């Protein structure tokens, strides 16, 4: 068993009230200023010279929404996450050689961004269910073989 019905509830319900645009863009922009070296992977996204520039960069906004939409694929099928991020794994690994621990940094910002947005509703238990999900995602995006 990957998740429990209790966790599934925390994931699905919380995900239902999530605005992919705002949260996704917030998570990406925050990842790039808090952990500046992740910028290297984003060479074609224009201006990333300052926190303010990142926050107003439109390519960052757009890509941030696509990331959060991707997190939506995991939610739709929690027990098959691995197979879902199969394509994205080879892209993030084989093609775009990304350090595996970066998927973890990005899961940490998303959780913090979710906490800032949902406040007290983002209880310890709800957070626990989301750590498993973001953790499950980061893992699946790092393939060693096949």
């Amino acid at each position: 068993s990957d998740f429990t019905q209790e966790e599934r509830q925390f994931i699905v319900n919380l995900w239902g009230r999530v605005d992919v645009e705002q949260i996704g863009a917030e998570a990406l922009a925050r990842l790039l200023i808090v952990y500046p070296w992740t910028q290297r992977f984003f060479s074609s996204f224009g201006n990333l010279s300052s926190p303010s520039a990142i926050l107003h960069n439109a390519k960052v906004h757009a890509h941030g929404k696509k990331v959060l939409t991707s997190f939506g694929e995991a939610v739709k099928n929690l027990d098959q996450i691995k197979q879902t991020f199969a394509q994205l794994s080879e892209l993030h690994s084989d093609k775009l050689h990304v350090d595996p621990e970066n998927f973890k940094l990005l899961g940490n910002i998303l959780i913090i961004v979710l906490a800032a947005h949902f406040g007290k509703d983002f209880t310890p238990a709800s957070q626990a269910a989301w750590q498993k999900l973001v953790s499950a995602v980061a893992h699946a995006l790092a393939l060693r073989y096949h």
């Binding site: 922009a29 925050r30 200023i33 808090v34 926190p51 926050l55 940490n108 959780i111 913090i112 961004v113 906490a115 800032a116 947005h117 406040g119 007290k120 983002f122 957070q127």
Partner: peptide
Amino acid sequence: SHSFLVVLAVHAPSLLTPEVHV
């Protein structure tokens, strides 16, 4: 350190700006 930032995000989100978060 992470658990704490999450507490701050909950109670003082507007304050935990990206530059402050950094």
